[model samples]
Structure formats: structure tokens, C-alpha cells
Target: QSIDQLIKARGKVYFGVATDQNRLTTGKNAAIIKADFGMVWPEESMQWDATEPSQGNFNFAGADYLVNWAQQNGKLIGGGMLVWHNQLPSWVSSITDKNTLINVMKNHITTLMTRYKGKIRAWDVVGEAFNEDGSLRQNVFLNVIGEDYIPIAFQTARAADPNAKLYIMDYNLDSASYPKTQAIVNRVKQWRAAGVPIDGIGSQMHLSAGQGAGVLQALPLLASAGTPEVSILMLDVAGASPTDYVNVVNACLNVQSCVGITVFGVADPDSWRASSTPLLFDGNFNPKPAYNAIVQNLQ
Candidate 1:
């Protein structure tokens, strides 16, 4: 199938909500089906720690179940990987030697990706590897293999699934001129020159309403420095309380080359007492005023 066909929508990639194994079995995943979101991502179903919590021992059971359900229901699912953080196991942190870490990480990617090749269209192949200042984050991968870990991970993913697209996903700062933006740009060029397979740049727009278009405007520049394709992952983004959906809609519409946008959760938070102004859900699955506002803007 053509790439566009493989992706959700004919061309205009639109909003989707997060889906996890619990969400699926709980029957709450029906929201994705109900809303008709063209694209969906695992909330945290396939992180490094969850997949390989016990060294060589890994668990794809939960992630596999989620991906299978999404595909069967006609949703295009993509998500984070067994990376240097989050899902990383105790064994990973225990490694004091850099070379040993490399071997371990390489094996992790190879095993994980080989298991579910075509099911994942793109991966957060490398995530949050750099600090806000654009320097290495000093995670296990970096401490072990130094900077080489980044390129090696990408290579492993390509070997596991030659056709699977790879994306570099990160949060905060949206532009190339931002402190850490230069490092991301440089690494993209380095990987390209070395023939390591890299694809898109993921702008994880965990943005608030008045953040302006700094990150959105930086897309073309980041694209030039990174891969040919770029998109806003829209993971933590939310409208201001109540009617703030207008700002979110306008931001999405205004950004050029923004192929997709995802609403983090279709349902409101489960708690009625606690509040995160940017949160889509309350304590329950009920839709807030902002949720309906998104529905109208998306329509």
C-alpha cells in the first residue's frame, strides 16, 4: 500500500486518543472507535521498562494485544519504544560499563521490533536523549556507549523492520535555535551521513494555549536539520479551561507541514476534585466543555 494509505486519513492526519492495555480490556478503548480518530498511539503500553523489565526477559503481551486491536478496528497505531528511560529495567541501570550497555540496548531493540514489524508504522525510535540544553541527558544509554548509542539504536530498528518508519520524539522547546535544538539537528545529520535510517522529527506539543507558534514555526527549520518529514505528536496538549479549543484549533490549522494532531485522552480525568487545567479528562470518562470544543473544531 502507498504510505498515505498506510497512514490514517487520505492526507489530512487528524486527532486520536491514547490507548493502553487496561484501557482496552476495560472497554474504555471504545472511545477511539466512537470518535473515529484516524490515528492512535499507545499511552505507555510499549515503553522500555514495560517491554524488557527483566533484562533479556521482555513482555510484548500487553502491547501486542493493543496493536492487534487497533489494526483490526482500522486505526493506525504508532508509539514510544523500549528506550533508555521509563521502561528500562533494573539491569540496565546496574551496568557500570559503557560497552555492556550497548550490547544490552541493541539486543532490546532487535528483539522488540522484530516481534512486531509491520504493525507499527513509526517509532519514537530515540526519545528525550538530550537535555533541554541539547546536550546528552546522561541516561543509561549515553553513559554506557557515550553518544554512539543514539545512532546504534536507529540502526537496530531498521534491521528489525526495514520498512518501519522511525521518528525522534521529544518534548518542550519547539525550535532549532532552542538550546538543545542544535544537538538534535546535528545528530540527524550525523545519522543520515552514516547511513543510519532516520525518518521524521516529532514535536511533542505538550503546549498550553498561549505558548504561541514558536515551536510550530520552527518545524521547517527542524525538518531541514533532521528528516524530510515532520509532525506534531500533540501528546500533552490541551485547550485552556472551557472554550480554549479555539486556540488549539487555530494553532493546528496555522502550522505548515503538521500532518497530524492527537487529543491525549478522549475521556475526561477520573477525579472530580483534582484539577490540571490542561487535562482533557476529569476523574471519570465524562467529556468536559473543552472535549466538546475539540469535537467541533476537529469536525
Candidate 2:
């Protein structure tokens, strides 16, 4: 069976990839996404800065292009982010008034979520909201509105799209034993218990080669959170062999709670970590050792 076919057979897992708008339209890009992946995440097009560069002004042409392609190709689309501290315009961060910041956040989330509504299968409603020490990261959202900003963000997203799976995505949980991961998991439970609309956890498994079982360690913790979906949002291994990539992916597949694994990029040259050759394909679109490893091991 093909990648998607095999995952469908498993009846729970969905393999995914992150690609750019340009790449999504290319023949080879389309082929790879269609054959090897079950979902598509625009690498940058749907980011806050890209979608709403100017306050109250929205430009989704870039994101729309990829979304259209994914839909026509029958690929499920994952909204990149509805809220994040970085890549935000100066206008958002400059507002010091609490009321003004709250309005700005709600408006952004509502408008984007409303427009995409039933089109998206999942959304990163809030991103990178925690510090490595398990405390909230002090972004403009927290600085202006406090911890309420998290639940408020999720609430607003839920209001806009009631059916979409909402997730709080984070990084640096390379190891399961990280106190920070425990902290995040505990927080999710607290939020859910309080009637928050959160539905999943997104583990940004930004791993490298030789990282051992760090990514694997966090799976059980995240899975135990009881979210409907647990995704490895970004999988990559720098300066690593094909075996390294195989080890990480196999670990994800071994964990029944992991519903999906999304590679950071489609090809090495286009990846943000191009120097690391962190993806499964080369610049010429040829299947590299990493790609072979995924196929062989998954089979």
C-alpha cells in the first residue's frame, strides 16, 4: 500500500507534510503530496504576519492558493496557526491597552476561523504559549491580557469554527522526561476540565539525528492527555543518517496515541534547515535514503 493507503488501513494515523504555495502547485510537489501524504500544512502562507500583516486587514491569497490545491487533491488541510507571538506585525505588539489587545486578538481569530470554517480539519489555535520552565511565555498577549489570553483565544476560535479540532502547539519537548512537557500536559488537563474547547496537542518534534529517544519519551505523556489527536507537527533530523530518520518515525508509529506525523518540509533545498538536509527528498525531487527508510520501515 501507499503511504496514505497504509495509514488508512491503520484507521487512525495520517501522515502529512509541510509545503510552500509554489511547491504545492508544481507537478512533482503535487505528486509527492498526493502519493506520500494524507494532509497538507502550508509552511508559512497561513502564519499571522502573512495572513493579517496590517491590523484588521487580511490577505489570504497565499494561503488560499495552497488550500484550494489541497482540497482539489483530496488532502486534508491543517491550519498553520491562529495565534502565535512571533511573526506578528508591530501593530499587534505595540498595543499596550488591555481592552485594545483583547479586541485585536479576538477579531483576528474570529475573522480567519470564520472564513476557513469547515474547510480546515485541524488548527493550531494557540502556538508556543509556554516556556521551557513550564511557565507562560511572556508575549504581548500575556503581557497585555494575562493567562486568560489562552482560554480566550481557544474560545474565540471555537466560536468561529465549532467543528475544527483545536490544538495548542509547542516545541522543545525533545524528551518525554522534560518537566516542561509534564507542565504542558497538566495544563491541558486543567483547561479541558474547566470546559475549554481544546481537542488535541501538537508536539513540535523538532528533533535532530542522534537525539536518542527524546521525541519518543514525550509521546506517552502527550497521548495520555486524552486529546482526540496527537500530532508530530515537525519531524526533522540534522546531520543524521537514514537510520536516524527511520528511528524517529518508527517511534511515532509505535505510539498508538500519535495520530499523525508531519515532516517539516518536502525537500532538503527548500527546508528551513537546508544545511542540515533535514527532509526525505533532495533538491531534484529524488527519493533519498531518508525517504527509503520511511517506506521500508513503515511497510
Candidate 3:
């Protein structure tokens, strides 16, 4: 059975993967995503730079392609991220005025969310706002707009598309007692108490081998803040063993509030970080030990 099929049947939301426009239309990769993923998140096409390269001017070409692909293939779409500091265009980043940045951000969020309104089921409204030490990371928005950027982003997103589930996505939030995790939870609580419209939290569980126990611990922590959903947004299993893959998947299944997961890529080389054999499929699209282990658990 396909991974997504079993995942949903077992009471989860989706088994997703990150895919690019070219990759989704390609040969073997296309086949894998079609059969296995219940949802597909665009790797970069939906980022601020990719969608709106210039102020007040937008381009949704690549992201549009992926959305069309998923629609035709009976899969849901995770709007990879609507607002993020890393891939933001220099145009948006260069603006120093708080009001100017807020307007620019609102337009960006509104345009993208409006364009993909109902197609995108969930969106990372704001991403990676905290550092590993639990301090708020400085970025264009925070530097000029202060911490208000976080709420502004989420507020604009909800106004733009009321139906979409909005989440705060980040890495290193997979540790239950980690300072970063605690900080984010506190921040989310602050926002919610003030009515910011946050729906969930996303833990980008980008890991190596034997980190699955931490994955287990982290899900509960994220859920403790009265979150409706918690997803392993990007489960990149670099240096992971077959048992490691099982631990990660089982961790999601074991957690009552945890929803689903997305393996970062379909196969190993699709990985881009100091890359390696980090996924379920290998070079030739053959299933690896990780695949076998995960499939075994699905049954």
C-alpha cells in the first residue's frame, strides 16, 4: 500500500513529501509522489522570493505548476511557507520602515494566499523565528518591524484565506525540553491569548540516526500549548537507519495530537544538505531498508 494511504487509514492526516516542479513531472520521482504522498509541499516555489520576486509584482509560475500537478493527481498541497526570512527577496528585506515592511508583507501574504486560496490546505505563516538558544532570530521583519511581524504575518494570512490552516514552522523544535521549543511555545501562547489565529505548530524534524526518541518527546511539548495539530514538517533522515525511520514514523502514530509527516525528499540524492542516502528510496528509485521498515509499520 502507498504510505499516505496507510497513514490516513490509521487516523493521521497525510504522508507528504517536498517536491519541485521539475521533479514532480519527471519519471521515477513523479511515480513515487503519485503513489505514496497524500500531500506534496513545494520545496521553494512558494517562498517569498520565488512567488513575489519584486515588490507589488508577483510570479507564481513554479508554484502554480506544482499546484496543478497535485490537483490532477488527487493529492493535497502544503503551502511550503508564506513568510520566511531566509528566502525573502532583497527588495522586501531592504525596506527599513515598519509601516512599509508591514504593507509589503501583507501584500505578499494576501496575494499568495488569495491565488492558492483553497488549494493549499496548510501554510507555514511564519518560519524559523527563533534561534537554537531560544532567542528570537533577527531578520528583516524583526529588525525593522519588531516582534509584531510574527502576528502581522499570521493576521494577514488569516484575512487572506480563512480556510487554510496556519502554522509556525521551525527547526530544532523537536526536543521536548529544548530552550528553543519552550520559547516558541511561550510565544505562541502569547499570540493566542491576544487572538492571533494560529492553528498549529510544525516541527521540522530534520535528523540523523537515533534521534527518534527526541522526536517522540517533542510532539507532546508542541501540543501542550493547546495546539490543534502538530506535524513533522520536514523529516529528513540523513544518517538514519531502518530502525530510525520506524522510530520517527511510530512517534507520530504514538502521539495523540501529532498529525502526519513529510519526508524531505523522495529518494536519497534529492537531499540538498551536505547530501546523502537519507530517504526511503535510493538512486534508482528502488525501495531501501528505510522504505521496507516504514511500509512494514504501515501494515
Candidate 4:
């Protein structure tokens, strides 16, 4: 299929992983162009600790470098800000409870959003806020902030970039049918009540191959979070193997309101565990079945 066709079919529903700095300097730019995708997500652009390792000190040089690259390339960029508790500063972990942690998270969100201002398109504002049972996770932020930080992050992000799209991303919550789905439902509602500017929820659909049907089934439950129909972002999507391509496409296609899927890694070594997951490209930058799958799906 032609680039135009692929983009037209999935440009809004399509995205893949590319780091902030590397994609700008590398010669493998052709792959991104060939994929006919319009969206790209940074692997770790906005980790709180990475952005501001020391209090009152913030760094945008690295993330800025990536932002410029995305702008020049005309690729709509999604910012990865408030996911993964491990990315937060150690100071946050020292807080004794969720209330204090929530305050710290508020400050962190305020600092980063204020800095980025208008550049980020959509952000992973809050992640892993609850356990599988819909209870709050034990992160220092949640422990101190209680459930209050959820609205705080979204509100601050909209305050920072009012015109941009905002999204809440999380893992396993991909299954909207899960009993825990209502936890997110409640969270989004709280965000609305607190006057938080929230746009959508992200599904971190890290499925094995052949699970496309599950993605289709769960889109509506996820969409219900938005009163007027929410934007669904397919964040951190990757299968465990070569045959999992269908799973990616199915997830995005299954959800009618799904705006797009941001693949977690394209060229990075797969699985990060055994380094075994087949990736979109090989060590030498050669395209793989996964890459072809993206092409076919977008096509």
C-alpha cells in the first residue's frame, strides 16, 4: 500500500515509539516515513525525576531536542509524562502517606506542565493509580495525595496546554470489561468534578498475539469514561512475538473512538526482560514482521 493510503487509514489511529534524541540523529528515518504514520511518542520524555532530578531545577534540553525534531518532521508528538512510579524522584518515595505524595505530585505536575507550556500534544497524565481491585496503588504519590492527584495532573496539564489533547494512560486497564474498569470510570468523573481538563484514557495494550477480539470488546467500556465519547490512545502496544501484529491492529481498529496507538518500541531491543520480543526492526535496522504488520494495518 502507498504511504497516503496507510496514513489515511490509520494516521489518527497509528503511532510508534521513537526516543527523543535518537530518532533525530539516526539515518533510519526512512522507516518512520515509510510507515506513513503521523504520530510519535517519546520513550521517556517526561519522567518527573528525569526532567527535574533536583528540586527547583528543571531541564528541557533533552526533551526540547526531541520536540524540535518532531515539529520539523511533521509528526504529531505525544508526551510521556506521569506514568511509571519508578520514574518519580526518590524524595517522593520517602513521603509517609498518600496525602503528602499527592502534594508532591501536584508540584511535580505544575513544574513540568509550566515548563512545556504549549509543546506537548497529549500527555499520559496519570498512570497505575489503582490496583486490579480498583483500590489506590501504593505509590508515594497516591499514598500522600489520596485519589486527589488524578484531577490535579489533568487540570494542571490543561492549564499548561489548553489547546492540546490530554489523555490518561495505564496498563492492563486495557480490559475495560475488567471489574476494575469502574475505578477509572470513577477517576475520570472526579476529574470532571474538580474541573480537571481531561480528554481521554490510554490503553496500554501489551497483549500476546491473537488477542484482537479482546481489544474490540473493551473499547466501549473505556470510552464511557468520557461523557461525549473519549479519545482512546493505544499507548505502549507491543506483542510478545512475531505473530502478535494482528493484536495491535485489532486493538486500534476495534475501538471506534480510538484515536491512535503509540507503539512502545520500534528499534529498541524487544522485551526488555529477555530482550526476546520481536520488534518492528532488527539490530541492523532491518524491518521485521512487526514492521510489516504496522504497514499492513495502516494500509
Clashes per candidate (backbone, < 3 Å): 15, 2, 0, 10
lDDT of 4 by residue, 131-187 (tens): 888777877665666566666677776776776677776666656568667787787
C-alpha TM-scores of all predictions: 0.83, 0.94, 0.97, 0.83
Deviation (Å) of 248 in candidate 1: 5.6
Deviation in Å, model 2, residue 93 alpha carbon: 0.8
lDDT of 1 by residue, 19-83 (tens): 67776665454753445566667777688777887878878887887788887777777767657
Give Cα distance to truth, residue 292, candidate 4, Å: 2.7
Task: Show model 1 residue runs off by greater than 4 Å.
Answer: 1-10, 175-177, 238-257, 270-274, 277-299
Best of the candidates, lDDT: 3
Clashing pairs in 3: none
Instruction: Write one digit per residue (lDDT tens) for candidate 2, span 83-200.
Output: 7887888988898988888888999889888888899988898999999999989999999998888889889889999988899989986677787898889999898888788888
Error of 4 at 57 (Å): 0.8
In terms of TM-score, which candidate is strongest? 3
Q: What residue runs in model 3 are displaced by over 4 Å at the alpha carbon?
A: none
